[PDB]
Amino acid sequence: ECCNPACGRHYSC
């Protein structure tokens, strides 16, 4: 959503 859409487009943190 900001930081964790997908861990900033990587995966999801």
From Swiss-Prot:
Chief place where the protein resides: secreted
Subcellular location: Secreted
Name of the protein this chain belongs to: Alpha-conotoxin GIA
Cystine crosslinks: 2-7, 3-13
Lineage: Eukaryota, Metazoa, Spiralia, Lophotrochozoa, Mollusca
Function: Alpha-conotoxins act on postsynaptic membranes, they bind to the nicotinic acetylcholine receptors (nAChR) and thus inhibit them.
Domain remarks: The cysteine framework is I (CC-C-C). Alpha3/5 pattern.
Recorded family membership: Belongs to the conotoxin A superfamily.
Position of the signal peptide: none
GO terms for MF: acetylcholine receptor inhibitor activity; ion channel regulator activity; toxin activity
